[PDB]
Design a protein around this ligand. Structure first.
Ligand SMILES: O=C(O)CNC(=O)C(=O)O
Ligand SMILES: [Mg+2]
Ligand code: NI
Ligand SMILES: [Zn+2]
Length: 331
């Protein structure tokens, strides 16, 4: 078995190898990359996502989210308070203000220490989940707005035609902005490109050990666990690496820098934080290997998780027994 310790693997495709996206994902899996739950892909040196980022400031962040924490430094939840709209140029200025900017630090490890010590005492503002793309239309390789759609994959594998669309999302971050522990909708893959700015640190649990993380989360968030049998679908819970290590949960960590892709694999729990002002683009995708994970994915039916239009068909076809209850949660 390849990669039996479930380490995060880093790949350096050549420009020739960067042509066929599906083929390269299958290659990485042949080497055991999925066992970690997360992989880094450094694009060939010839490749670019677009010519410059000089003209992005007029993008609108319609609903910036202030991420307010509750709990203790290593075990907390966050809720999202909606803020008034602002442009990316306004948000960048905010991120660089004395109240919100990255503190002085020695290196990524020192910054990580400061994040876990101090996150809860601040409420950073995250320009998350913005439909759109920063890939130039002429970028033909690994253009996250030109991927094969999940609906087309389901149709190719299973023969059933379904409604729905699959488009990317932009994330504008600042120091301490945080993504809570989660897997993707329907335990899909994700791919994330860091277009510009400061780094993003990731934590990940191998898919084969995801239920260990879920059992710890039930213990640490006991009222949330009584409320919902899949409350990590709410995307609000944080658990630090120190707490994971104290409880024997297998995980790994890595820092993504501008110009790099990350892939999350089906049922790979992940969480993390931004180092400073940045912009990422991410989208879900599927492969034939996903189908079995989609059929087995947990679902929130308490009503809190509320997701896209396109998830309806995935539940209806892959999980017909669950469909009725899940849809009640959606409506
Ligand atoms: O970048 C973020 O805030 C969150 N991204 C992801 O969870 C992902 O790409 O799967
Ligand atoms: Mg603009
Ligand atoms: Ni994700
Ligand atoms: Zn729920």
């Amino acid at each position: 078995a390849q990669n039996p310790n479930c380490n995060i693997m880093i790949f350096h495709p050549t420009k020739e190898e960067f042509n066929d996206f599906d083929k390269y994902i299958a290659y990485m899996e042949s080497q055991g990359a999925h066992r970690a739950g997360l992989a880094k892909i450094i694009p060939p040196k010839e490749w670019k996502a677009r010519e410059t980022y000089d003209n992005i400031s007029e993008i609108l962040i319609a609903t910036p989210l202030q991420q307010v924490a509750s709990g203790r430094a290593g075990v907390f939840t966050q809720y999202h308070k909606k803020k008034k709209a602002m442009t990316v140029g306004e948000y960048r200025h905010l991120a660089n203000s004395k109240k919100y900017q990255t503190p002085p630090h020695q290196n990524f490890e020192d910054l990580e220490r400061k994040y876990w010590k101090n996150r809860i005492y601040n409420s950073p503002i995250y320009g998350a989940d913005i439909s759109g793309s920063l890939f130039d239309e002429n970028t033909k390789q690994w253009n996250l707005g030109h991927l094969g759609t999940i609906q087309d994959l389901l149709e190719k594998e299973c023969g059933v035609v379904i409604e729905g669309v699959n488009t990317p999302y932009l994330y504008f971050g600042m120091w301490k902005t945080t993504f809570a522990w989660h897997t993707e909708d329907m335990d899909l893959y994700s791919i994330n490109y860091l277009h510009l700015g400061e780094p993003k640190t990731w934590y990940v649990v191998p898919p084969e050990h995801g239920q260990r993380l879920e059992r710890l989360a039930r213990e640490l968030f006991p009222g949330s666990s009584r409320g919902c049998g899949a409350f990590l679908r709410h995307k609000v819970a944080l658990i630090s690496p120190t707490v994971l290590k104290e409880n024997g949960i297998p995980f790994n960590r890595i820092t993504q820098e501008a110009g790099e892709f990350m892939v999350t694999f089906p049922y790979g729990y992940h969480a993390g934080f931004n180092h400073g002002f940045n912009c990422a683009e991410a989208i879900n995708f599927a492969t034939p290997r996903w189908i079995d994970y989609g059929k087995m994915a947990s679902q929130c039916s308490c009503g809190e998780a509320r997701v896209t239009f396109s998830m309806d068909a995935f539940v209806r076809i892959l999980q017909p027994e669950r469909y009725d209850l899940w849809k009640r949660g959606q409506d």
